[PDB]
Amino acid sequence: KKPGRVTNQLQYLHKVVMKALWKHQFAWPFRQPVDAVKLGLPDYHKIIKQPMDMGTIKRRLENNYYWAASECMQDFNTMFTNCYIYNKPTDDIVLMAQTLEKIFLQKVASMPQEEQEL
Amino acid sequence: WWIIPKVKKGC
Ligand SMILES: [Zn+2]
Ligand SMILES: [Zn+2]
């Protein structure tokens, strides 16, 4: 498969960042792929071409899918951005996403800046 | 859970 490895930043995103978000109270809509049919969301997969969720990010971290932490960071920002693009700014889902991203940025701010392979 | 999907939650 694709090249994967373990780095200090990937371990931090797993054992610190993902841990804080997975148990969060606002996390339940993000722990699995959006099911636009079950939720009745029109044109979701025509608008969202790259769906992403914390469940997929979690499995990728736990299976050493990522080569660098920047790939994992991109997946987190894809998940947030997809929420802001499809949903209306005052929908409940956007406020929950903004709250989760607030904790995300707070924990990522303390991430070790130098990425080293372990 | 959702009252109205994405728009308004119940919990
Ligand atoms: Zn679909
Ligand atoms: Zn884990």
Numbering used by the authors:
A (entry chain A): 70 to 187
B (entry chain E): 1 to 11
Question: What is the paper's account of this structure, in its own sentences?
Answer:
Within this class of proteins, the bromodomain and extraterminal domain (BET) family contains four members that are transcriptional coregulators and that recognize acetyllysines (AcKs) using a tandem pair of highly homologous bromodomains (BDs). Despite heavy academic and industry investment in this area, the generation of paralog-selective inhibitors has proved elusive because of the extremely high sequence similarity between the bromodomains of family members (90 to 95% within the acetyllysine-binding pocket residues). Using the highly conserved BET BDs as a model system, we conducted three mRNA display-based RaPID (random nonstandard peptides integrated discovery) screens using a single library (which contains >1012 unique members). Crystal structures of 13 distinct peptide–bromodomain complexes revealed highly diverse structures and binding modes among the cyclic peptide ligands.
Among BD1 domains, peptides 3.1B and 3.1C displayed little selectivity, with affinities of each peptide for BRD2-BD1 and BRD4-BD1 within a factor of 2 to 4 of their affinity for BRD3-BD1, the domain against which they were selected. All of the residues in all three structures that contact 3.1C are completely conserved, consistent with the very similar affinities observed by SPR. In the structures with BD1 domains, this AcK lies within a channel formed between conserved Phe (in the loop following αZ) and Asp (αD) residues.
